[PDB]
Amino acid sequence: SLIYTITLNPAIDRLLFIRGELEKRKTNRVIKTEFDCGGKGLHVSGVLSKFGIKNEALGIAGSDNLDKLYAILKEKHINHDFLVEAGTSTRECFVVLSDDTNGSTMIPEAGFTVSQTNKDNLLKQIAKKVKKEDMVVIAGSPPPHYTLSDFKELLRTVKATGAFLGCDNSGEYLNLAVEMGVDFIKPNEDEVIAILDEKTNSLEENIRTLAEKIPYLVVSLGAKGSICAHNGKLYQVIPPTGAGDVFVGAFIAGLAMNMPITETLKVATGCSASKVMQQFDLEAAGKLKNQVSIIQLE
Amino acid sequence: SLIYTITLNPAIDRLLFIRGELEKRKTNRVIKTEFDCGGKGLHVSGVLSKFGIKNEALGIAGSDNLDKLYAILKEKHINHDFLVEAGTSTRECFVVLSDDTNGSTMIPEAGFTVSQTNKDNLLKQIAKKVKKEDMVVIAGSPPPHYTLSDFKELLRTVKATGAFLGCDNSGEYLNLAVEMGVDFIKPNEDEVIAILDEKTNSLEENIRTLAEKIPYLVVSLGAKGSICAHNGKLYQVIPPTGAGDVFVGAFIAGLAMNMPITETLKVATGCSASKVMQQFDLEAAGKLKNQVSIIQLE
Ligand SMILES: O=P(O)(O)OC[C@H]1O[C@](O)(CO)[C@@H](O)[C@H]1O
Numbered sequence: 001s002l003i004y005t006i007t008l009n010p011a012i013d014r015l016l017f018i019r020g021e022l023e024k025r026k027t028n029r030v031i032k033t034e035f036d037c038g039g040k041g042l043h044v045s046g047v048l049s050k051f052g053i054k055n056e057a058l059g060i061a062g063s064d065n066l067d068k069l070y071a072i073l074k075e076k077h078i079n080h081d082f083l084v085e086a087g088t089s090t091r092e093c094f095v096v097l098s099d100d101t102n103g104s105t106m107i108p109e110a111g112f113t114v115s116q117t118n119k120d121n122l123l124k125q126i127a128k129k130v131k132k133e134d135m136v137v138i139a140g141s142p143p144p145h146y147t148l149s150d151f152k153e154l155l156r157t158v159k160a161t162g163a164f165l166g167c168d169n170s171g172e173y174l175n176l177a178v179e180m181g182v183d184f185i186k187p188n189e190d191e192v193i194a195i196l197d198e199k200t201n202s203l204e205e206n207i208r209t210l211a212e213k214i215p216y217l218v219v220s221l222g223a224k225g226s227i228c229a230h231n232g233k234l235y236q237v238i239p240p241t242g243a244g245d246v247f248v249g250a251f252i253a254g255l256a257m258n259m260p261i262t263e264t265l266k267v268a269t270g271c272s273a274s275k276v277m278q279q280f281d282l283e284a285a286g287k288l289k290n291q292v293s294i295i296q297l298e
Numbered sequence: 299s300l301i302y303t304i305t306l307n308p309a310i311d312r313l314l315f316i317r318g319e320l321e322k323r324k325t326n327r328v329i330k331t332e333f334d335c336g337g338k339g340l341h342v343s344g345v346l347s348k349f350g351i352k353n354e355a356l357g358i359a360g361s362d363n364l365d366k367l368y369a370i371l372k373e374k375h376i377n378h379d380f381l382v383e384a385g386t387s388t389r390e391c392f393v394v395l396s397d398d399t400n401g402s403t404m405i406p407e408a409g410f411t412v413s414q415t416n417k418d419n420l421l422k423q424i425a426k427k428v429k430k431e432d433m434v435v436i437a438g439s440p441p442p443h444y445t446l447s448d449f450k451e452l453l454r455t456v457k458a459t460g461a462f463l464g465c466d467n468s469g470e471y472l473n474l475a476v477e478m479g480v481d482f483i484k485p486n487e488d489e490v491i492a493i494l495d496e497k498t499n500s501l502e503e504n505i506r507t508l509a510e511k512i513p514y515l516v517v518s519l520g521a522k523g524s525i526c527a528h529n530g531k532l533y534q535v536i537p538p539t540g541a542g543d544v545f546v547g548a549f550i551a552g553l554a555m556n557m558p559i560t561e562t563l564k565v566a567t568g569c570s571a572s573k574v575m576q577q578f579d580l581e582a583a584g585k586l587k588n589q590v591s592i593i594q595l596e
């Protein structure tokens with residue numbers, strides 16, 4: 001079988017290294033510039049590959065900076081079959097970083113408007129490629145004007161093939177994903193409250209309730225860690241940006257390698273924490289795996 | 299005669315429009331992206347052209363994004379004869395702006411290392427082009443590793459042709475410019491103190507003193523306005539980013555059109571203020587010209 005990632009609104013991450021903090025009306029000189037691939041799906045493909053797990057990235061890229069995007073993907077050993085929109089450029093997400101600090105300021109471009117033709121090409125692309133034994137991971141939110149309506153066809157077209165379907169989205173797209181019934185989603189506390197529009201029950205109850213529709217539910221609680229529901233059980237995951245994408249990637253890898261869920265959660269969490277410490281190193285992420293603690297909630 | 303601008307470290311300004319202020323560890327979504335030419339020299343060429351004054355821009359651009367730089371220049375009606383460094387890209391200066399606010403955060407890339415060959419090509423380029431009746435305006439500081447030594451040849455090579463030479467630089471380059479004896483420079487208060495390394499005399503005296511070497515000395519005092527020395531006289535210019543580049547451009551234009559110095563100062567100052575009000579419009583800058591007041595210091 002195979003794993004497919006779908007990055008509707010890909011990007012090129014441009015790391016801008018400056019000295020100290022980022023003043024907000026001052027001039028901040030860049031010491032050096034660094035590039036990496038952007039888009040949730042892509043980040044997820046990057047993790048899968050480090051795990052020696054086969055996968056292919058799908059999405060819509062711009063023509064004008066394609067060569068640059070491909071060099072990065074080749075470097076991150078990411079197999080892809082992108083659709084290309086002529087006369088446009090993949091957006092960039094400027095990441096103002098710093099060795100002198102541990103912060104990061106994000107300034108992502110909105111991305112371009114996708115042509116109707118490439119929307120349809122993505123649909124058959126999925127029909128022609130995805131099998132029931134495969135897994136699909138639509139990650140990152142849609143580019144401007146890729147409507148909820150468009151998103152609906154996308155999800156249904158995937159479901160129609162019977163493959164595992166995970167979605168890392170937000171806003172009405174996440175809600176929509178839930179209503180459609182995907183196998184995986186990683187909402188934050190508040191997104192959970194939003195999806196249900198319920199504010200009087202405990203979060204726990206919101207999650208157990210939501211687990212009735214999503215079989216691999218993982219709710220991020222920020223620094224506190226996470227809560228994952230699966231097979232009737234609820235787990236509190238306690239750890240010792242892009243951290244969320246790596247978590248997804250790691251989590252998918254675990255399921256792909258078919259390892260215990262509690263175990264998958266320790267690996268996912270070890271890799272996510274491994275980055276919140278990096279400007280990730282898989283080897284380095286492995287030392288954190290067994291520092292992660294799981295607490296089953298009864 | 300003709301005017302030449304020299305932008306040793308050109309750039310492409312990428313305006314990033316977000317909502318409200320710029321948080322510094324948050325994600326700031328870009329509403330729309332806009333491009334403009336970067337580099338002091340170029341900005342100066344942009345002003346000259348709006349004044350219908352003939353000029354040509356010189357400098358070293360990268361190959362990978364040349365087409366994009368040329369489209370902008372064509373749009374700003376800027377004539378150029380750039381030298382090109384193969385396999386490299388012109389740096390970008392990210393300008394985080396906002397309609398909801400009147401601020402701007404600058405994040406300029408350092409730029410690339412220029413090849414020895416293009417350093418030399420710039421030198422003969424100047425010898426073959428510049429005549430005594432022309433004006434040269436080296437503006438913006440040098441790219442990484444374009445040494446003080448390199449800068450020395452540049453300036454001397456221009457002087458050797460007998461043309462008017464203005465320099466808008468900083469750090470040791472500005473000092474060097476002063477020692478070399480250029481016709482124009484626009485240092486800020488502190489740069490003046492630095493050039494002389496004198497801290498016990500009034501700024502006025504520092505300027506009159508410095509005027510002995512620079513015949514068109516203009517010292518910027520920030521919000522307070524400016525002080526310009528010329529022909530033995532000292533003027534306090536009182537007004538009603540990129541504002542400095544436009545001032546230079548406007549000032550050069552005045553001298554080019556050979557209009558009174560006090561007058562040149564009112565135009566330069568009107569145009570600079572015209573931008574500190576813009577996200578400049580020449581027509582709009584004209585309404586501010588006669589709101590500028592000149593006070594001769596005796
Ligand atoms: O796919 P999106 O939802 O548009 O997000 C893209 C952004 O996500 C990040 O990976 C942060 O999670 C950034 O590096 C940037 O690439």
Ligand SMILES: O=P(O)(O)OC[C@H]1O[C@](O)(CO)[C@@H](O)[C@H]1O
Binds near residue numbers: 337406438
């Ligand atoms: O030529 P430099 O000294 O490297 O400065 C370039 C920068 O100058 C600015 O025009 C501000 O004066 C920015 O827009 C950016 O292009």
Ligand SMILES: [Mg+2]
Binds near residue numbers: 169170186187188
């Ligand atoms: Mg999210």
Ligand SMILES: [Mg+2]
Binds near residue numbers: 467468484485486
């Ligand atoms: Mg200056």
